[model samples]
Structures are given as C-alpha cells and as structure tokens.
Target: LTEFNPNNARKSYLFDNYEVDPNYAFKAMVSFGLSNIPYAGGFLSTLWNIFWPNTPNEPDIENIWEQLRDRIQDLVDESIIDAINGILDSKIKETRDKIQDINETIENFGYAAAKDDYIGLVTHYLIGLEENFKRELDGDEWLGYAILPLLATTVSLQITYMACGLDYKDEFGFTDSDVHKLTRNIDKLYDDVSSYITELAAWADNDSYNNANQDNVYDEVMGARSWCTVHGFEHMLIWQKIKELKKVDVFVHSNLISYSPAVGFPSGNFNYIATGTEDEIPQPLKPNMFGERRNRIVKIESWNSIEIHYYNRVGRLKLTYENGEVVELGKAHKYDEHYQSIELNGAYIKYVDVIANGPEAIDRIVFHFSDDRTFVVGENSGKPSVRLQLEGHFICGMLADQEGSDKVAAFSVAYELFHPDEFGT
Candidate 1:
C-alpha cells in the first residue's frame, strides 16, 4: 500500500523538501502530544500565526500564537518565582533574587562575563537561564514544560545514536542490542501516535468545538481552550507545517518505497501556493481546481490502464513537469505485486472509475478518469448495470470482496478526467 505513494506531482513537491527550518521541526514533534483528544499545547496549535504568514482566517492564527506564547512565558515566570522562594512576599522576592543574581555575576566576573571559554563562567550565565526555565517547569502546575526538555533530549540522543552508529557504547555508548531496542520502541510510538496527526489536523480545521468553547473550549473544543487557550491555536503552526513530508522515490523499510500520503490534505491542505510566481506560467496539479468540481456518487465500475499524466514526479526545474507518465493497472511493472493485490480487492482497476465510494459505509469506492465512454457511481438496485457516463472523468470507486482480506490503496486528489476524444478502454 505504501508503494502507491508518489505518482502525483503534488506529492513530489512535498516529499522533496525536508529543509523547512529544523527549529520548527523540533518544536512540532514535542508539541503534538500536548494537543491530543482533550486538546493541549504543541507547536502548531500555538505558533501557527508565525509560520503561515499569509493564510486566510489570517489574524486568527496569529492571535492564537501570541496568546500561547504569553501563556508559556507566564507559566515559566510563575513557576520560577515559586521554586526559588515560596509564597512569602511574592512581589519583592522576584526582583531581589533573580536581578541581584545577574547583577552579582556581572560584578564579580567583570569583562570575563562578556568573554569566556568552552567551559567558562559565561556558560554559567547561560546555565543560570536554563536553571530558571527548569525551576519554572518544576512546580506541579508547570510539569508539562518539563516534558518539553525530555522530548528535546530524546531528539538529541537519537541524533547522537545515529552518529555513533557502530561504535555505540562510550565510543560505543550502548550495547548493540540497544540500537534495535531504540528503533523498536520508536516504531511503536509511530504506529500508535501517527493516527493522531490527522485527527488533530481535522480538529485544527473544523471549528465545531470553538462554537461553545468560549466557556467550555477545553472540553468541547478539545483543548482549543485547554492549551493554556490562553496559549493555544492550530492553523499551521506545529505539525501541519511538516505534518506529512512528501518524498520522491525515497527508500524506506529497506524497500524503494515512495511514501506519498493521500489520506490527509497536502501540506497547505486546501490553500493555493499563494503569491509570487513567473508571469504567464501555468502551475502543475492545482488540487484546488478539483475542490471546485464536486458531485454525488451513484454506482461503481471496473477500469484498467488509466494513466495520470503528471503522476510521475520528476527532478529539477525545481517543479514537477505535468508531462507525467501514464498509469497502467494489472500490468507487469515495478509495482506488480501491489497492483495485483488491489485487483484482488475486486477493483481489477488497471484504471477504476470507482473513485471514492460513499464513505466506508458501503462495499465500493470509485476514483479517477478518461473516455468516450466514462462511468458513474449512482444508487441503483442490487444489480449494477453499466450505461456509463460516456463522457467526463472516470468517477472513482472501491470494491469489497467477500472472500479476500486485502484492500485497495488510497489514491491522491489528482485527476485526469475525460477531455476530448479519449474513451474508456
């Protein structure tokens, strides 16, 4: 199922870029867990305004970011005050303690405070700052902040583990067995938490919870309020920015798997590439166009050899050329085994017009196009007759075989509808 990934140009754009600010990547990973189901703070829900820069429902994302930022700082501030000195005369104690500490360090260290060695006193000032962040999070109310450092450390240790490679304990800091153990544990987290990425994205987009959450945002909006709301929002801050990184034909699980995710929306989801481009230049695979062409399903049909021209992801030119290769189903190709399995699902779809059947509630799903004779998925008697659309993109669908356990892979939102003389084969 993973093999069916990168045949679309839209996917190619995403998969090719992993260089999108490592800082953003770092925060997003940890913040994600904070916003699960009940809703909490993570990267995106908090700082979306900073990243999206130019998205619709514009300032809303930004407003969320500011509130979230202030909240984190607020929590850290209060936590630090409480940790250093209990609730005596809270106001006077803060200035006397922190300010005097910084003042004394400068007075004692002199110019040395400004310049120091690798393990010099300068580092202590930096260390002092960290200790305060620690104290800030140490209080019971700020324990969540503690998780941030742990997650960040996990990332550091991981990178170190990779760098150490064969020499794992000291020169090789770990037993060889630890490598497998580490990978094994991480994989478990992947399989489990990944589903949440999309779930959170849906929650991020849909405003159903926000309606009543002004008072009950935490419970209703699912943390839309609870995220410190005083520190929460989710337009494009955390994960969505790196949510599902697309890739060309990258190797994976030791297989040359091109991982292109169709299950969720593209990086920007429904948004167009927004702003700045060559004049007179036509763009490739504008997913927004398809969003404009909507319809209702009727019935499903079988198809073979339907090729999505720009399905092939090309390198350079910076963008993928629309001159994509044709998709041939049921044929001997690099993905023969995968295609065969899809066929077994009752799709025999060299090119199936079963597009997207009405949800998973039914037995079939239709998706895709071409033809003098096209197909439609309409509601009919138990018996489905094929008069077909005779024109229009092949309406895609799905099939459920009673005897088989396998299923058809999901397809991208890409389309190749019947344009002129082409007819269904």
Candidate 2:
C-alpha cells in the first residue's frame, strides 16, 4: 500500500477511505509566509555585491529597475518554488482564503497521491492547474485571474513539472520519508531554505552573511554542478529502485517493442527470421525467399519504463546510453499490421460505418506470471517461429519461461476501445 498524510481541517476531500494529502495546507502556510516577507527592492543585489565580490559588475543597467529585478531575482526564484508548491495550494483565492482552503480542494486529485496512481493523479491536477492559471490570469485578477505578479511564469511552470513528479512516488514526504536516497535530496532543499531565512534575517541588519555562499538553491533542485548528469538526480534514484523491482514489470507497459525481429530467409513456403541483415539499401532484398522459421536476435536490454503513446504507435523512447552496437536515444517506432475488411456484413463486423481497419488500444496490457515469470513479447526469441514475406504485415506476442515456481500464470490479451490518451498523442 502507498503512504499519505491526512489533513483534518477539511472533510470533503476523502478518497476511497484514504484522506486527501495534508501537504496542501503546508504549501499554503509557506506561500502565506513568503507573501509576508519584507523587501526593500534592492536588498538582494546588496547581498550579492558583498558575497559575490567576483560577480561581473552590472556592466549595463537600463533603469534602476534592472537592479531592482536582480534584487527580487531571489524572490523570483522563491516565486517559482512557491508556484510549484502552489499546485495543491489554490492560486485563485485570496491569500487569506487560499491559505485556508487547500485541504478542502484535494477532491479527487488527493486520491492520486495515496493510491500511487502516478499517471492518473497528475492528469487531474494538470487539467485543473493550467485552466485555472489561464482563467485567473486572463480574466479578472482573482475572479477573472488578472495574471498574478511575477518576473515571468517560467519558473512556476518548471516547478509544476518537478513538483508533480514528486507526488507520484509510492511514498514521498521530503526529508521525512524513511527512504534515505530521496530524503538526502530533500535535505538539500529543506536545509538550504532553513539557513537562508536565518541568513536573510541577519543580512537585514548584521552583514555577516556577506561572506557566505549563495549556491543557487533553486537550480540545485534541478541538479546543479553537473556537466555530465542533469536535473533528475533525485528522481533517478527512485527510478533505479523501480527498475530493481521484478514483479513491477507487469505495471510497466508490455506492448512497447524495443527490439525488432531479425529478418529471416526462406527455406520452404515462408521465410525464417535471420540476423546480420544490414540497412534496407545496402542489402536490398536478394530477390526470391522462402521458409517459415521465424524472428529472433533483436536485442533491447536495459529499460526503465514503457508507454503506449498513440493510436497505432509505441515509441522506443529516450535513454542515457551509447554502447557501440546501438546508440538509441531518439529512436521512435512500432510494428503494426494493416487491418482489412473481407466484407463488413456480419454481427461483429457490421458496426463499422465505412471501411474499418480496426484500431486497437490496450488499456491494461500486462504480463501474468508463474515460476521465474516471463514478459517475453515475441517469445523473447525475436518474434519466435518468426517467418516473413516482404511487407506481409505481421506482428508477434511473447511466451514465458519458468523454473519451479508455478503460480497459475495465465493467458490474456485485450484491446481497450475507450480510454483517455494521456498525451494528446
């Protein structure tokens, strides 16, 4: 079961017996605190001059407002943090009301965090946030959404993407989650903020903090100080865990084919799948072929996640690799056969309005297991019994292998006709 913290101030947000995330209230408290912080316009720059003695002197200042912008840049950074933290926090209401109403607003959205409904919960929030932000900014200030004040919305949006990802974890509570890997990253963000406030307090009067470092705490969340790695230092650890999970593969998309079946040559009526065939042009078909052996030998190791992204597509998505044989990063493709209609005149076939090449959607494409368990799409032997004819339009499914553990691993295949596409893709 997934973990969640509950909010008592609100009762309308119960989810399937689990309580709405109480974190929304915490986010609101922080936002309310930030809104109340004092600023004298150029305070940030003054600290920068003292601490960042090497920072290139403002070579060109259009208006003093530019310096003013620099001073508030920290707050701009804070605003982003605030904005991301604002997801659960209602943005359209008054500070007084927004601060008070978060727990009540969790609604269906709150349940996502509890069930660890990674995909579903984020979708709920994504739809609501953008709509409200647009209407709130475009319409009236609060009612019509007179765009809230900011340097720009760039940071806020960045925060949204980062923050939502954190929510999808099975159990994430920042510095409090018992998981050391995740908590370490949380410690970075949390600890930095604690002293910064103290540093700010002293900087307001005493100039002691002038000698300290202003290590961009905001950007650090995005993985600063790495020429090689990127912004996912925190999430990457969780992903490593996700990969180690053997049983979890069932939840991962099973239909997205990463490796392709080797082309087979013919011996009999149909051709048997073979390897060593180079690009289409270099080794253009050697004319006549016959045999019904089958495909094998297309290798795609190391995968973290899979997604069924479109109507008739499944992209073999990105990577962090380059192993000589294949440097697949921007690779995108899927193997699907062209559908036909012999004659749409019967019961199951009559539903077609016109020419119907049945579109198939697998809402719950998963692998059931026994023994050691198997998720062999194409029988793990490269489209096993894989035979081929030039453009014959065929695809294969996987078979399993097991040792002693027989747990009633079964057979099943389903095509979902009605389900929301996560991406418009």
Model 1 quality (TM-score): 0.22
- In model 1, the Cα lDDT at residue 72 comes to 35
The root-mean-square deviation over C-alpha atoms between each candidate and the true structure, in angstroms, is 21.4, 26.6
Q: Candidate 2: lDDT of 385?
A: 27
Give the top-scoring candidate (lDDT): 1
Which regions of candidate 1 are displaced past 4 Å?
Answer: 1-174, 208-425
Residue range 9-93, candidate 2, lDDT tens digits: 1211000111111112112212222223245112112212221123356663222112223322332344533443453234322
State the TM-score for model 2: 0.15
Task: Provide the TM-score for each candidate, comma-separated.
Answer: 0.22, 0.15
